[PDB]
Design an enzyme around this catalytic site. Structure first.
Site, PDB file in Angstrom:
ATOM      1  N   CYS A 129     -47.584   0.442  64.176  1.00  0.00           N
ATOM      2  CA  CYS A 129     -46.603   0.013  63.209  1.00  0.00           C
ATOM      3  C   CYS A 129     -46.590  -1.528  63.364  1.00  0.00           C
ATOM      4  O   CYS A 129     -46.197  -2.045  64.412  1.00  0.00           O
ATOM      5  CB  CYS A 129     -45.252   0.633  63.542  1.00  0.00           C
ATOM      6  N   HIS A 171     -45.321   0.340  68.314  1.00  0.00           N
ATOM      7  CA  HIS A 171     -45.365  -0.969  67.662  1.00  0.00           C
ATOM      8  C   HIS A 171     -46.623  -1.702  68.068  1.00  0.00           C
ATOM      9  O   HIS A 171     -47.060  -1.627  69.214  1.00  0.00           O
ATOM     10  CB  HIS A 171     -44.138  -1.832  67.982  1.00  0.00           C
TER      11      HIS A 171
END
Ligand SMILES: CC(C)(N)CC(=O)N[C@@H]1COc2ccccc2N(Cc2ccc(-c3ccccc3-c3nnn[nH]3)cc2)C1=O
Length: 365
Positions: free
Chosen positions: A128, A79
């Site tokens: 992401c 992330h």
């Protein structure tokens, strides 16, 4: 003509987020990039699922290897967060919502990389959502549920899919990354979902395939570099002999520098012993194992899918995935239940095994 004093790499893949959606692609991507870079003679450390503290410590140890003329590659998959024109790497323990102080600032690592006299410094982010020769690749693919596709689980991320098809080329790193950018541009799925920005201050013709020169480690850099090169070395196979005569073979395998698989099998049963079974127990508490996840009939049942080719069959498997949390020697117990032919009682015996500080545990974190 261009030479590398040494070739080092640190690859981090974050999947198992405590307060955020779990990712699947970093596992396969970090595993495949590790093998690809080792083929190019890089000394690689690959770590899966790191906390804020663990990420800062691993990056700091990698930065310490970047001496004059050294080629360094840092890869992060997981992330990502963007705030005030800065990009951040999100560790697995990051609370929801995201706070910058709990994340690693990408720009700050770039600043530290600029102070090194590296021959080449490649920093790749797969998220992401004086020269140091820094080549920075920034892939952003915000989604998984935004594509509608039912993915394979052992499926590759978009950046790695194209990267692995070109990384082994003997071409200047900036020219090679430009080809990956073109490959992604040709893929219709990528349209409006994936992005890739390459920043480069590479003033000379350097490639990942460049040979290693007169390495010549200094006095204070010696131990650090030998330890990094040895964090890939597994404990050797051992044969444990029990009081009753039963022999158990203990084997070791690695998915990542912080993920090791232990397997056991009964190699000798004396005729006097009618029935016996072996199992592993009492691992250090810092590892957070749980007996319901250890001693499985197949490696897949432990969460291991990547090294099934190198694992012998007919064993009991245990997966230790938080090796970076190990502060002391890896001491565990091999337990044996056995029965003598002509006897009704089941006898229990157990011995402790000390396999030192394996893989990432060798590093002074
Ligand atoms: C940072 C990262 C991960 N490199 C960014 C990145 O590449 N993202 C893309 C986005 O979705 C794609 C779109 C097109 C091609 C490939 C992919 N894959 C691969 C992939 C996606 C999902 C799963 C999956 C399978 C089972 C269960 C849950 C998940 C899951 N759910 N959510 N995430 N994993 C496995 C692999 C990606 O991960």
């Amino acid at each position: 003509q261009p030479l590398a004093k040494d070739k080092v790499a640190l690859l981090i893949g974050n999947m198992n987020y405590r307060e955020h959606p779990k990712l699947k692609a970093p596992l396969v991507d970090v595993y495949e990039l590790t093998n690809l870079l080792r083929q190019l003679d890089f000394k690689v450390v690959s770590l899966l699922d790191l906390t804020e503290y663990e990420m800062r410590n691993a990056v700091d140890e990698f930065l310490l290897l970047l001496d004059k003329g050294v080629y360094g590659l840092l890869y992060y998959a997981g992330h990502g967060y963007e705030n005030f024109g800065n990009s951040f790497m999100v560790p697995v323990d990051a609370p929801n919502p995201y706070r910058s102080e709990n994340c690693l600032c990408v720009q700050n690592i770039l600043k530290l990389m600029q102070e090194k006299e590296t021959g080449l410094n490649v920093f790749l982010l797969d998220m992401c959502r004086v020269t140091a020769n820094i080549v920075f690749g920034y892939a952003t693919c915000q989604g998984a549920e935004a594509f509608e596709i039912q993915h394979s689980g052992l499926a590759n991320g978009i950046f790695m899919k194209f990267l692995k098809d070109r990384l082994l080329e003997d071409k200047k790193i900036t020219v090679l990354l430009d080809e990956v950018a073109e490959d992604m541009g040709k893929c219709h799925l990528t349209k409006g979902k994936q992005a890739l920005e390459i920043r480069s201050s590479l003033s000379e013709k350097r490639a990942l395939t460049d040979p290693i020169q007169g390495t010549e480690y200094s006095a204070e850099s010696l131990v650090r570099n030998l330890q990094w090169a040895k964090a890939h070395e597994l404990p050797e196979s051992m044969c444990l002999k029990f009081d009753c005569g039963v022999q158990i073979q203990l084997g070791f395998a690695a998915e990542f520098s912080n993920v090791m698989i232990i397997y056991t099998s009964i190699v000798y049963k004396p005729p006097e012993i009618i029935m016996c079974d072996a199992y592993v127990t009492d691992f250090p508490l810092d590892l957070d194992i749980d007996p319901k996840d250890a001693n499985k009939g197949t490696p897949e049942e432990t969460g291991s899918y990547l090294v099934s080719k190198d694992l012998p069959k007919h064993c009991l498997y245990t997966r230790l995935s938080s090796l970076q949390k190990l502060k002391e020697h890896l001491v565990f117990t091999v337990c044996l239940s056995y029965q003598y032919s002509g006897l009704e009682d089941t006898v229990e015996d157990k011995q402790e095994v000390n396999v030192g500080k394996p893989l990432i545990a060798k590093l002074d974190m």
